Symmetry: D2
Subunit: 466 residues, 4 copies
């Protein structure tokens, strides 16, 4: 039930607030998770406010039916966030907790990332207008002018709708949180190491130095080894230690993708297939945030996991990109020419990975044909939206295949469209719309979460213009 | 789990707040239920604050175990309150909703009554002290002085602990709420009747007049009669219309007690038996709040119900007290002398009713013996606390049996003691303690909910003195 | 200084809040003045917010210069409100305080009335745009579309700008405040009269009955008479007791107008002249709110006063309208025909009164000429805006002269225009603009303060269309 | 007037809040001054709350007279704080503003230091009890038990009164503020230097490095010299750069003391004399916070200033302590033995300085006599409290003269006593009381502002025991 789903948001947010009110016991977050609490409270309050202002609270079972899917996805993301706060509140091996936790976590930004990617289902809250016969027209034209061509700009948007889509002037707050946690952590570490009163202190010093290169000093971590790096060269390749993102195994992957594939008979919905694609992308171009190139990408290198209380949703990272010291059908066509670590080239692998996910079948029932450009074809059952995006990347020229920034946002747009329509036409081929946003407005090596409300809207605006 | 129970409070309160944020659609409350939301938020916030201040958030599974039962009862009462808010938010027969709802409801005060009767399980939050060895003594003596003999006074208490036990200077707020609802209601009724545009309006006028005697004008209520008052005399007996309390069927009783008895083999725990007793008392002396005397009380006149999401708890009212126009073993011994509507006499019936509830067996396997004073005796299995209270009332002299005020509060004290100790000695015979509070401090025709924090504490103070 | 004026708002509001935090001692308001505190805090917070959002806090002395006059008038009204709260907080003759105070006060609504009439100098806060050269155009066109022809509607406005111009859904809150004060008052009166323990109680009963006709029972008010009603007939003429407004002497007028005139050599600025006119109008048509007609209006019947900390501003009421039991140059031309208590006729007197105020000279250096329609002419020094309004009313036909509703709002529009422009062309003759608002939208026996934001805006919108 | 003084607090706090609501324009504070706003709002709210709870708002002119002096001093400190926020909000030479401002400012902690030193005039708010005759005794004994001997402990106090004397668990908040300002500053500096687009950037790099030793690189600061360090040795003596306190000229002293003396005929009240003493002490032992010893102290080295809107109050620093590369009557008696940079020795100079301040006359109308121990004697007019403290320090043994920690707090106790009693016996010689606090509880190289509520109370407790 629609309104009932809202009460679920209330329940989850109350749970979060109850857990958080006993705050000062945390020694890692309480400056990250506090941001989560504030953002979630703001989101709930603003969706409640806009409901109260633009709906009428009598037709609880007749003319709210459109609200179901978006609010359900919202309870999912809220639940996901609360569970992260829980795992950060656990009392389990404080030292191992420090290690596993944020030196390089950013799970808070990942969660708010999903929150943003789905909050733009405020477009639902706008379906209340669709009592008074003349009024309906007023609301329609109001929203129409809210979607006018002259409204496409970071400044103009961020000023005319900042408070409707959660953007304050606390856009820069996220980074301050990412910082004060660090200093509380090092203060606690110094307190521990100098107020020690075996070998725990030694780690602290090694650990404290990292937050102050490549320490990697001692086997002091005796490393009691369960089931399952050769020379002191390429030391500078240890920067890896400064590539933090919740889509990159900085610690351990539960299982990989190719493993999860061969016994997969469909387990991936268009609504987890698209997601499984995005967590890669959202995480991919952060590599280019330091210009590092994965080079070889394969389902043997994408470590998925389980999303807890979700309908099969998984959080995936990417492993093996680092470590450049030591079948080819997963290589790029241009990297067939060895007879190739272009930023552009990696898309062929990304596309190739998605090729499996959609179909669930590995490419081919030949290498020379790949250079020519002939490519395997997906089945009739596969949907129109997914197929168009992969094929465009599929083209042989390396420049004509789109970068990750040019491919992440368009995926998340598909997400918003799906969440808006539980049933099943897609608007248009997605690629054409992106070019517009890419075409003029563009001119961005890395993108942060603040841009999501704008990017999501621009397509809504751009799409109307056609 | 203790802390887990708290998260349940968070969930319930979030549910309530989500339902309430869509407020203005209500046409009966939104000045009563708003009081509920404010009080519940204050209760949650203050228990959270005192937890954060007097506990330490690491021993989540070791030294909080004492918190379980009180917080569980708290989630019960919170749940009960949310469900009332729901029933008031329902969209079902707005006119019948107006009738059934508050002209004489007071369900808000009944709910806050239970909330007060159980919040004094803040004494649990004081068990955190029972890390630092010297500190434990400090907290013990602090609480000891919090329980000093020189602290027994409405003013001194209400000033030195008002904010710890929820009492503001919004003690008088409750009545203002009970009022503004009325005026919003009559304003909506006038709007409806004068903006009518069959016979709905006629009711309004009759209904509006009541809130402006005995209208009872017409059979305009055609009264489509399901399964199942003789002359125009004793018109003044219609005051009944001004006796409002959520423990008195002002509209219909689902089932009575004697009905629920004969097939009852125990269904009543000491923790619902005591409660079933109290809802009577809490509701009994409100009759004396207008000096009306029930006279004849029998399980054939106590209409119990179901408490929804509770462990068999029921909300009961009293029916047949009014209507004075038209076996004796349920009569008082002094009203054996007919060969008798004393306020004192009714206790014999109340006691007699409780006599069944404890034992579950009707008195006797004789009337002359009752005048003499011989009385039936309860079995060995029955607990010590319940037996002492009934027997004292049982005594033949009508003056030596205690009034309802003198018997309600002592029952609720047993409630607090039980909630504090899930296992199973009782402190002392309860009657001795009441006499002390009754003995000097007393000097009270009616009592309101504000007095509950004080009354509950006084026994804790009085009991220590012994 | 512009920003400095804002700090003055801060100072005044802090003063108000400090006085109000010691609230419960008040026995008349604390439900009226509390509304004042809430409204003023909201006004300050929202002007601060919109400043922070649409200005840049560096050009504190260069590009804020336009903000001076509106914010200065704002500190005036805030100061006026605080002083009212003071007079209500005074400890002076609690009984006389009750009498003089709200049985029929409405000073709270009068204050918020001025607050609304001047807050629409938010148009100033919009002058910040007038750093980035392209941006200025964006803000200009944004505001332009904020002033589009398709935006003229109570619903559409009250929904699309309610929070920018203070209108909540607490528009109806004002009346609830006007009510709960009454009931706190009667509760205190009952407490006093029944807990009396000479003749003070007798008044209470007489006073309590009025709030429960024409009591006017006894000379119990011995009436110790200072310097300075004949028979028991026309009893029904005592309704006067139900005509409450802060522009009508319900208790005593310090001085009248004609008195203040002959020695007045200009004391009335266009900015107090217009105001002196409005307080009449705002107060005039409330008479028609019960259809009562003043009939004869003269500067010998307008009791002005002093506005405390203001630049000569005065609060005026109207006396002698009631009492219908027992030179003509102040009579209407049609009431020359006696050889006449039309609602329309009174305008001639109102206009005639304004005729003095502008010029400061009584009409004429003749009665037959007045019937013909010849009228005295104001001097060249008098401004264009004031002259156009009086002359239109001046016309002989009684129907073609505008009603008070049709003349109050247009005056207050002149107020907003003046406050917006300290220097000195007027936009257009004011009368033409009103006809538009009057022409279709109209279809209003009485108007309340909630309509002011809309009415003020409509002219801004209507004026652009021309 | 007492209550009127409160309204002044309201005015000042409103001024502060109005200035602060336009926050993000600040590029130095907005993490320091924000702490000021929060603390001041908390202080105002809590004094208002305790007034409302323990006073009665009718005797506004009779039984509040005791509140005058403490609340007046409070408006002073609030005003002082607002003016600091102003100077930090000024738009004057952003670069010079950065230099002069907090690299080593701590003015926020200095202001809150005065706020704490005077808030313990909450003891006034306790004078309301001194209507009901029996009640007065209740309040007296309540406060008595609030001052029981068993209550002397950091934990017990900080837990049983933390919220009454402003101490949260935001005691550690102060340091976080002192930090985030730094990082916002370096972020803005990096933004400026890398987005430069003459020689301003060079400074930034030098400046940025300091916040990352002794740079002191270039005369790039051309140093346009007004009216009015020899070799590259003792480089390590540049630590001075890490000795930050608002009582130590880190930049320029307006005037010194000896200058201000010879024409001073009294200008120093016991209420600015004591203060002038304290700002030294509060600032003195921070030198021992890095063990540095001033060695030679003279009115030729104490640079006083003007306290703006205060009654002659001045903020003084200490200059010349650093720079150890290159009449004796101001030297310590033991440093007469040269025929001496003890931490103990400096007191003789401090005492000697105070000796002037009290009397206003330099010591003597002889050196050999000083070794013997004969000392100049102050006049009969000088008060008893000041004389006892200086004389004890005056004793010849260097160990028997008290350290700064042992002498700062006792001075501030005199402050509280004076503020509590505008008229004029002192309680006892102050020195005896300190020994008690010093005697057991002590066991503190440096003390921070958090300790002030406790230290101030302990004397109140200790003094009662006698």
């Amino acid at each position: 039930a629609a309104m009932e789903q809202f009460r679920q948001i209330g329940e989850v947010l109350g749970s979060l607030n109850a857990l958080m009110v006993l705050q000062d016991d945390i020694l890692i977050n309480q400056r990250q998770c506090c941001l989560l609490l504030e953002l979630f409270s703001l989101a709930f309050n603003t969706v409640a406010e806009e409901i109260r202002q633009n709906l009428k609270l009598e037709e609880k079972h007749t003319k709210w039916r459109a609200l179901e899917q978006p609010l359900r996805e919202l309870t999912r993301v809220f639940k996901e966030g609360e569970l992260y706060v829980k795992h950060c509140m656990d009392n389990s091996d404080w030292w191992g907790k420090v290690i596993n936790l944020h030196q390089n976590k950013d799970c808070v930004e990942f969660h708010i990332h999903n929150l943003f990617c789905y909050f733009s289902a405020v477009v639902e809250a706008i379906e209340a207008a669709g009592l008074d016969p003349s009024e309906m027209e007023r609301r329609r034209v109001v929203f129409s002018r809210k979607y006018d061509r002259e409204w496409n700009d970071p400044k103009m948007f961020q000023w005319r709708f900042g408070k409707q889509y959660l953007l304050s002037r606390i856009c820069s707050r996220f980074e301050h949180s990412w910082r004060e946690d660090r200093w509380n952590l090092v203060e606690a570490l110094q307190e521990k190491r100098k107020s020690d009163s075996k070998t725990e202190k030694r780690l602290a010093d090694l650990l404290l130095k990292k937050l102050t290169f490549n320490g990697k000093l001692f086997p002091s971590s005796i490393l009691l080894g369960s089931k399952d790096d050769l020379e002191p060269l390429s030391s500078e390749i240890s920067s890896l230690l400064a590539l933090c993102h919740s889509n990159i195994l900085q610690e351990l992957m539960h299982k990989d993708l190719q493993s999860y594939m061969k016994e997969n008979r469909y387990l991936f919905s268009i609504p987890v297939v698209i997601d499984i694609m995005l967590q890669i992308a959202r995480g991919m171009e952060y590599l280019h945030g330091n210009d590092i190139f994965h080079g070889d990408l394969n389902p043997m290198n994408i470590h998925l996991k389980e999303r807890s209380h979700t309908e099969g949703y998984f959080h995936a990272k990417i492993c093996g990109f680092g470590l450049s010291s030591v079948p080819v059908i997963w290589y790029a066509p241009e990297v067939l020419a060895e007879m190739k670590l272009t930023h552009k080239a990696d898309v062929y692998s990304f596309a190739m990975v998605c090729f499996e996910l959609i179909t669930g079948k590995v490419p081919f029932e030949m290498t020379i044909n790949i250079r020519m450009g002939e490519r395997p074809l997906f089945p009739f059952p596969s949907p129109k939206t997914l197929v168009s995006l992969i094929k465009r990347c599929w083209h042989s020229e390396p420049s004509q295949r789109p970068n990750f920034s040019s491919i992440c946002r368009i995926l998340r747009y598909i997400k918003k469209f799906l969440v808006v329509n539980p049933d099943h036409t897609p608007l248009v081929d997605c690629w054409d719309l992106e070019a517009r946003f890419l075409r003029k407005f563009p001119g961005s090596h890395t993108a942060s979460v603040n841009q999501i409300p704008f990017q999501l809207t621009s397509y809504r605006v751009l799409e109307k213009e056609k």
